[PDB]
Design a binder for this molecule. Structure first.
Ligand code: ZN
Length: 64
């Protein structure tokens, strides 16, 4: 028994820095009910840091 999984993203993780009114957003003013964030995330503006990515492996190989 357990729980906790992660998926993959397609487009930069945006957000709505404004509210939605008048059948349309205020920050982006989109025309979709599930309109995805418009403002792109912020690399600097944050309270966390991540190290550099690891290195890949060599040519494929069987599992025997
Ligand atoms: Zn927006």
């Amino acid at each position: 028994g357990s729980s906790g999984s992660s998926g993959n993203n397609s487009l930069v993780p945006k957000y709505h820095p404004n509210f939605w009114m008048d059948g349309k957003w205020r920050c982006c003013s989109q025309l979709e009910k599930l309109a995805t964030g418009c403002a792109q995330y912020d690399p600097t503006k944050n309270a966390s840091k991540k190290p550099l990515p690891p290195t890949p492996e060599d040519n494929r190989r069987p599992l025997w």
